[PDB]
Automatic annotation (TrEMBL), chains B, E, F:
<feature type="disulfide bond">
    <location>
        <begin position="16"/>
        <end position="41"/>
    </location>
</feature>
<protein>
    <recommendedName>
        <fullName>Secreted protein</fullName>
    </recommendedName>
</protein>
<keyword id="KW-0732">Signal</keyword>
Length: 502, 49, 502, 502, 49, 49
């Protein structure tokens, strides 16, 4: 059995957790993982776009083919020797990794805080035995270039032009079945009571699917712009965004900087809000003091950690840590999504709130944490209200067909998109007066400024929901919406007068 | 799937959950005539259910 | 005698510095400190707003009551035993603090750069003997949960539902009388020559009073938004915002990151301008070479500190360091406050300017420091001229009655605010066309852009007063104001002609 | 000769590289360096502006005179003793530094990673011997205050009021000929195929000349704003912006922070894009693991460095590291500069691209690196296109004479600037409706947002060319430009209807 | 000193570089009538040289 | 409680602190007719009282 995997994942896979072997669990997970009906491949709008050169790295299972050169055949040691010259730093990083030094882990003693790693090594080996990639008496020797890029525990030559692969999540999960299972279980735990978002979303398990099933990403002609979106949405496909290649250090994936490249910016500024809170500034001041090498479960005891981090908050669930980051999500970043606000007081939300409270009480009293979490929920709704009021105005204009160029210069978005008011596509595509300025402004008000306000509140950065983000920027958008609307009403009256004069 | 309820009605509900139906509370979002709008809890607990 | 506490504080307190005992100094200070007339409680708009759950932590002296549960009656040892479970990090952090390890301090050798703490321990002990909290012959055993959260040197059981408090500044000053007195002396040293700001402001001594004395804070309906402001404004009430609970590390409070959660953002971007300066860049690069544990008086010698930091610049005054951060203040962040620019050449400013020269010349020659400080003063005036030109235009419009919706849709602000032009309230509250767009623009040109310009100047970040903050964004405001000005003229001239014709 | 200096430098200096001595090379380099023809002095607009007080440290060759006080005739040991009191941290930083510890360098053993420093010391002695500044068997004992600030290897007394100088690049280059020549060699290597920029530009060799030859810089009255520009433009004059006075630590210049004060902000956010990329975040996470004392050439082996940093990428060329940073430049930050985009497919740009690919393939495969750089080039051009469309609309209004206040309230810029559409001047000087709002909106679209989109792409920060910088903001500019164009047309229309009725 | 080529034309040119003159590509920049403009490689390689 | 002085006057004052009253300086703020405004020192010296 895999003790950290949710019942609902065994249920989804029609497996018996008391019975299933690693081999069977792996195979069921991968069948779902590779299936178009479950998100794999080019998705529903695949006819509208083609890969660019970098996509072979972004979605290897769909696009990757080995290079035509070099036309060489190689064994395990030749990977290392030739690459030691052709990609020298990859060889140096790999040599420094746990992957290349398995005997070290084997020789760990039980008074070593890293001792947990030897259990993990034995679990990996048992997984490989169940898959018959490893003899029941064989030790895993190393995890080398040939293993990840060709076939696990490969004993013979590989043809460079045929056998080379980019390791995808299913490759890693050959050994690391637990992590890969915990990750894939997001598909089964992130289910909204009223379908506020699609089942399994948002999550790392479906981030790629989410990217390619976005209308504007499929429809727009600026492929290189769109592929920067893909760069932030590759977790589903590859496991090296938090603990990067070729070091693959868990210590690294535990630092807040691991999450920042993706979890930042104008519509979800978590990096910015976290780093500026007391929590983040303490983590900056104290990073030199913590032992980042200990597992998350030991961070606060053995690690010395005394301020919270992204991984410690978001991987934690009921006093345990897994790669599933979805089990406490309530607001999901965009407070305006239909049904999210309405759901905030539900029993489902309240159990998830209780889970958060537990997280925070690693340090704060329950009372303190509940006090602050109430302020987050309510502050979030107050920003939502301010937005809703501005939207009523511009949205009226739309129904009346009175937005600038609306009836005169509003060309349709690229296929397969459908024309509409304030739609996500208008953030990545514009032509003529599609969108109008007021339309974009109320759109960004919700997308950017309300989301950032909620991020700031959730991440305990006061300036990030008051002066600097959230409220001040929303305030400005409201003021400029009201102001334009009045001018437009006045110009509309002045025009009425001029017909009447003729 | 859920009946949409505006953000200010959610706040007013939350500010009344523990109240008697005749109690009055301040709006968290509304100002009219230089003053914070007041809301009767009976009116709001009503609108939600 | 606290020889680092100014005369004007003993005078203000009606004490003779030679004769006053620690007990008498502490009680005089605390009498003033807790007095509503002097800023304590809900302040003059207390009828307009109620606390929220988090308020019990922000202003404990007004609002805190211990929780109804756990129903428990605990000895000193039981606090630690039960919380090891209940709030585990607090125990861990406390256990590794100086508070928890007073014998370590008693054992310092005099050639240790940290020996001064051993003087400070004995000073605390002397204070407590004078207050009757410690025996003439008794040493202070520890500073534990029960000491801060119930009563100093408590000897018996406490009732958890009745006796627990949040430690406020007065709680800390029981022992830390010097630091408490230094901080409270801002009330007496921060006096402007012409009432540019209220006596004792700006300061950490009156930050919370300043917050609750801000009309829009007291008046606005969104309490959770207002409480973000309160979160930057709690120094007055509690001493843990620079050196945080529960480690209480003086080393942490010396680091620039300790100031950054509050002194950052659109209207005072100190963290941003300092960290991008050569100064703050060098502090990032050398943080691991500096000994942060040595006192500020020793940072440049024994700490090996070679670039300046927030605490080292702003706590230093005429060769000494204290918790009073007001004595060298000249511009006070917002260069448009009436009387500030015109006071910049007074004798009073020039003496403060001399104190700053003293600070810079620990490193630079005097000629270099004065050359730069001259550029900071004149660059701030240049900023100021530019906004002044812009405000002439928009102010003329307000007085002329010509702002958008000014006559038709400008509702009044929430009580007890009075309608006005370009008023702080319009940054946190808007409705209809109160404010108008041009009005918010120019209000922001001063409050945000001119203020950041000056911060960039003061903190030696050239892009922070030229391209990126300051001049660039003010240039854009001026251009859009002039543009909207000319447009609105063409439109009123056009509707004169429709009028003529009618 | 100097093995890392280009042939085109020896040529330009009329020197024969097989025979030139250090003395000869130095003298030729300096003759070019101090010639107004080649960019020294006040430049072609010298009559339009006067130095401010700080200008004596920004351009010491044009402006510096020592101070009139103290009157002191001083020997080497006196500088140190008196300044131990006058500028104490300067002395202490100096004492800690390699310059004051040359026998440590002499004693470095060949198994020390820092060994190359001895070679560099011996090279410096060779240069000075060639120059007659040092006896042929005389060891250089130290580089002290008197050496940099009066005369290298000075034996006797100096007059404070007459002999003190600010050490400029030619002063450092007396000993560091290699690095000075490498730097100066940018004048000869940075030559565009079609004169896209002036020869030698952009470069650190001509940063100061570039600044003072900017019309608005010379023309604007706000001297203190202008000198912010100058503070990012002094590399040509002084060698301490990367490795700062008075430690002059090479380790410090290798850290990305050393470049950040200049290479950041609204129109070239390299610091922001690089630090947010996975590259930058790994450098943040691993800064404490790498040995920053090793030279660049050893960074990836002996330094343990496993992610790239600004210096490693930009000082690398074809396998060697030098202070010339110009040799791989293709785009040069501002994608809209005429001839830049047209040049992107030339043999000249392909050649530089190959040198880039060689840099990346220290770690990545060539196929991966070429995949990404293809994305960078086409994404840049996608941004350029969107701006070009918006600019067609605004430029049309300009030639129509129809911009707001174009013919009624558009004063001329200050001398010697000439009036024009969307010129650099309008970012630092505005008056009336010069520039118009649309006009400024479009200039910034190119200058700020397109340039930031390019920097995002080059430095591998996805959010920095999609949502948060580049495409997002350019979209809003486009939308707003379109909206106001149409609003302006419908009002023109309505105005037409009115003088018809008249 | 170079003939100006608009960014859209550079992009079309680059999109065609590996291609026959009769191949048709998508524009990287232009949308007309709800669709990405297609471009014929021959026509564009002609426009550049 | 201080008589208001504009920043352009504070600056002209500043530049004229140490001049004869007939000496003339450039404005730090003002451009008129394509030229930085010149200031006769006695005049802004007189504006301060
Ligand atoms: C220890 C690992 C922590 C966890 C888990 C959480 N927080 Fe925290 N928090 C921690 C410290 C050491 C501090 C600084 C204390 C100080 O002196 O400022 C904080 C700070 C806060 C604050 C601000 C308090 C203030 O006085 O300004 C809040 C509002 C806060 N923390 C809330 C909070 C929440 C809601 C958490 C769970 C989601 C949470 N914290 C976790 C340490 C730790
Ligand atoms: C004085 C040096 C303290 C000692 C010793 C301990 N605590 Fe404390 N505590 C202190 C302060 C300044 C505060 C913040 C007050 C405020 O108004 O914000 C606190 C707060 C707490 C809290 C509640 C808030 C929170 O972040 O959880 C708890 C639960 C708490 N402290 C527990 C605690 C324990 C268990 C201690 C001994 C191990 C302990 N505190 C010591 C100051 C001091
Ligand atoms: C940031 C603005 C601070 C606030 C608010 C408070 N303190 Fe502080 N503290 C700060 C610094 C930068 C330092 C180092 C001072 C130095 O010269 O090195 C300190 C130090 C103390 C100490 C000394 C402990 C020691 O050095 O061993 C104490 C006892 C102390 N601070 C107490 C204290 C109290 C009681 C406060 C509220 C009145 C308080 N501090 C606020 C920064 C800041
Ligand atoms: C001869 C009188 C010198 C003059 C003038 C300057 N420097 Fe120097 N420096 C000199 C030597 C012999 C050495 C040691 C060999 C080596 O290169 O390491 C140095 C060292 C440096 C370093 C590196 C220090 C370190 O990180 O270990 C730097 C960055 C450096 N020097 C820069 C420098 C600059 C900018 C100068 C002008 C202000 C300068 N040096 C003058 C010899 C001499
Ligand atoms: C300010 C004092 C700077 C420091 C420190 C650094 N750089 Fe710089 N750099 C600066 C300027 C003003 C310019 C442009 C000069 C001009 O001709 O106008 C530059 C130029 C570069 C370039 C070439 C830019 C291009 O071709 O577009 C590069 C590659 C560059 N600078 C790199 C760089 C690095 C890596 C730095 C830290 C090691 C660094 N510079 C420091 C200003 C300043
Ligand atoms: C390699 C992984 C890099 C690192 C680390 C940094 N930069 Fe970079 N830079 C890189 C590329 C591929 C490019 C575009 C090259 C081209 O023109 O096609 C750039 C661009 C610059 C420039 C403009 C000069 C140029 O070469 O075009 C500058 C001034 C620049 N980058 C500065 C810079 C700074 C300051 C960095 C650290 C914050 C930095 N770069 C990192 C590759 C890499
Ligand atoms: C075991 C049961 C104990 C004992 C022996 C003590 N405490 Fe503590 N405490 C306990 C709980 C379960 C809680 C949570 C209450 C809640 O958050 O709803 C607390 C809370 C505190 C707090 C925070 C108070 C607040 O948030 O308002 C403090 C400061 C605190 N407790 C201090 C404390 C002290 C000083 C004790 C010995 C005198 C002590 N506790 C004993 C559980 C237990
Ligand atoms: C560019 C056109 C992009 C597309 C097509 C796209 N992204 Fe993103 N992103 C997050 C949210 C989403 C969602 C919602 C989730 C879902 O539908 O399942 C979609 C469809 C989407 N993106 C696609 C989140 C999560 C926010 C949260 O806290 O919940 C991110 C983190 C995130 C990253 C990101 C980056 C990284 C810089 C970029 C460039 C984009 N996105 C662009 C955008
Ligand atoms: C303010 C009025 C300024 C002037 C007169 C000026 N700068 Fe700058 N800056 C860069 C670019 C340039 C160039 C183009 C190069 C050339 O002509 O040779 C000029 C003339 C100029 N600036 C002068 C670069 C390089 C960008 C790149 O990647 O190529 C910088 C780095 C840079 C820094 C900088 C700062 C530092 C914050 C400031 C305040 C200014 N500039 C202001 C500006």
């Amino acid at each position: 059995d895999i003790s950290t995997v949710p019942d609902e994942t065994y249920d989804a896979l029609k497996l018996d957790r008391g019975k299933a072997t690693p081999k069977e669990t792996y195979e069921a997970l991968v069948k779902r993982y590779k299936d178009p009906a479950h998100g794999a491949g080019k998705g529903t709008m695949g006819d509208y776009w083609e890969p660019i050169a970098i996509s072979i790295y972004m979605d290897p299972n769909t696009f990757y083919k080995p290079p035509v050169s070099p036309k060489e055949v190689a064994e395990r040691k030749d990977c290392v020797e030739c690459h030691s010259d052709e990609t020298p730093v990859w060889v140096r990083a790999w040599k420094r990794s746990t992957h290349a030094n398995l005997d070290k882990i084997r020789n760990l003693k039980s008074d070593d805080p890293l001792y947990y790693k030897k259990g993990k090594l034995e679990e990996v080996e048992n997984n490989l035995r169940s898959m018959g990639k490893l003899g029941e008496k064989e030790t895993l020797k190393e995890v080398g270039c040939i293993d990840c890029h060709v076939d696990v525990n490969k004993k013979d030559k590989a043809d460079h032009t045929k056998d080379i692969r980019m390791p995808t999540a299913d490759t890693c999960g050959t050994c690391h079945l637990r992590e890969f299972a915990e990750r894939e279980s997001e598909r089964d735990t992130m289910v909204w009571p009223n379908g506020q978002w699609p089942a399994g979303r948002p999550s790392h398990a479906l981030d790629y699917t989410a990217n390619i099933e976005t209308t504007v990403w499929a429809a727009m002609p600026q492929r290189e712009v769109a592929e920067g979106c893909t760069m932030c949405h590759t977790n589903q496909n590859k496991c090296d965004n938090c603990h990067t290649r070729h070091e693959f250090s868990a210590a690294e994936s535990r630092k807040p900087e691991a999450c920042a490249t993706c979890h930042s910016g104008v519509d979800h500024n978590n990096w910015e809000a976290y780093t500026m809170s007391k929590h983040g500034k303490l983590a900056e001041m104290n990073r030199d003091k913590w032992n980042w090498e200990v597992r998350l479960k030991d961070a606060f005891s053995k690690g010395g950690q005394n301020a919270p981090t992204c991984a410690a908050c978001h991987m934690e669930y009921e006093g345990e840590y897994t790669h599933n980051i979805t089990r406490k999500t309530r607001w999901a970043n965009y407070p305006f999504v239909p049904g999210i606000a309405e759901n905030i007081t539900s029993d489902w939300s309240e159990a998830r709130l209780d889970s958060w409270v537990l997280t925070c009480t690693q340090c704060h009293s329950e009372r303190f944490a509940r006090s602050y979490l109430d302020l987050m929920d309510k502050g979030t709704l107050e920003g939502l209200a301010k937005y809703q009021e501005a939207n009523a105005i511009v949205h009226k204009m739309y129904e009346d067909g009175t937005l600038t160029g609306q009836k005169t210069n509003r060309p349709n978005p690229p296929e397969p998109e459908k024309p509409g008011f304030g739609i996500f596509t208008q953030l990545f595509w514009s032509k003529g007066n599609n969108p109008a300025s007021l339309e974009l402004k109320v759109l960004e008000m919700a997308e950017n400024n309300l989301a950032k306000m909620h991020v700031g509140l959730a991440h305990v950065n006061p300036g990030g929901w008051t002066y600097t983000e959230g409220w001040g920027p929303m305030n400005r958008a409201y003021v400029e919406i009201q102001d334009e609307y009045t001018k437009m009403q006045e110009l509309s009256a002045l025009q009425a007068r001029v017909n009447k004069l003729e | 799937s859920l009946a949409p309820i505006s953000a200010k009605d959610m706040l007013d509900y939350l500010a009344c959950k523990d109240k008697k139906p005749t109690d009055v509370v301040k709006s968290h979002t509304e100002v009219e005539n230089g003053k914070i709008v007041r809301v009767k809890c009976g009116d709001i607990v009503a609108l939600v259910q």
